[PDB]
């Protein structure tokens, strides 16, 4: 049913990304060359975010921001909203696709509740953050280098590492990777066959796994929870910056040249990074 509601939209998003990465330019939006046509490589190419000349206007094809023209519609940078919006629509379509597959089979939908994490990550990073910001010009670009630039910008302007939510998201991602590796390794070790692994972990790690369903639930739950908390933290950054800044240490270090903490040096890096772009 809904399995045909995402295929056209996902294919259009993919086609838009492919068209942008090789033909359109970011000269009139960022003053940069961001496609294969100009001479960029795979890492450099990016579907750049729209310029800071319209604000939050979506740059529709039939909208007066381009007036039906295509060269203008590409130069204004409407391809970024096009790609992002179609991708989000297709992603929620796949959410409903997993939902309806689970409904048809008759088992509890757990692939959908797991896939919910990427949905939150996408809607928070690419949609809600620019909405909370001035305009799309500060939204992340659809590129390998654009993502890194956005990451560094958020570090400079928010100290995102010091945020509890990114910390717990890092913990969730690394725990998911560890659990994946350990489950695969133990399965190929005992290759039932659970008593051997349980004894091995009881004697090695002490706190062994009660059941394989428990371990499977834990590896299902750790990374999705980490992603959800990271998305919630980004959304908070849009509304209310949740960074616990120890101003006591800041004042203690400002006028004492014999005191310093790595938090103080992180603050130094952040403020110098702010001052670097005027």
């Amino acid at each position: 049913w809904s399995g045909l509601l995402l295929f056209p939209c996902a294919f259009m998003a993919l086609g838009g990304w492919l068209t942008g990465t090789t033909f359109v330019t970011s000269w009139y939006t960022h003053g940069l060359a961001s496609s294969y046509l100009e001479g960029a490589n795979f890492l450099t190419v990016a579907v750049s975010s729209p310029a800071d000349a319209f604000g939050h206007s979506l740059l529709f094809l039939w909208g007066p921001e381009a007036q039906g023209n295509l060269t203008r519609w590409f130069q204004i940078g409407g391809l970024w909203p096009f790609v992002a919006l179609h991708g989000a629509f297709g992603l929620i379509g796949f959410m409903l696709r997993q939902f309806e597959i689970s409904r048809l089979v008759g088992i509890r939908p757990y692939n959908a509740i797991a896939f919910s994490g990427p949905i939150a990550v996408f809607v928070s990073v690419f949609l809600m953050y620019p909405l909370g910001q001035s305009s799309w010009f500060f939204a992340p670009s659809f590129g390998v280098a654009g993502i890194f630039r956005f990451i560094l910008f958020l570090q400079g302007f928010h100290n995102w590492t010091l945020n509890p939510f990114h910390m717990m998201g890092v913990a969730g991602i690394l725990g998911g990777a560890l659990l994946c590796a350990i489950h695969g390794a133990t399965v190929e070790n005992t290759l039932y066959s659970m008593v051997t692994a349980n004894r091995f972990w009881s004697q090695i790690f002490g706190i062994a796994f009660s059941n394989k369903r428990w371990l499977h639930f834990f590896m299902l739950f750790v990374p999705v929870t980490g992603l959800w908390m990271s998305s919630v933290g980004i959304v908070g950054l849009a509304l209310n910056l949740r960074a616990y800044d120890f101003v006591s240490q800041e004042l203690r270090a400002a006028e004492d040249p014999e005191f310093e903490t790595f938090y103080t040096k992180n603050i130094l890096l952040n403020e110098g990074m702010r001052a670097w772009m005027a």
């Binding site: 294919f11 086609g15 492919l18 090789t22 294969y36 046509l37 001479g39």
Partner: peptide
């Protein structure tokens, strides 16, 4: 159908790869 499911991806990909192949030469 499968016909569209394959052609909608095939018919622009050859055009695009030919384009990139030519761009691999248009550079001075």
């Amino acid at each position: 159908v499968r016909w569209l499911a394959v052609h909608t991806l095939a018919v622009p990909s050859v055009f695009f790869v030919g384009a990139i192949a030519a761009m691999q030469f248009i550079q001075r």
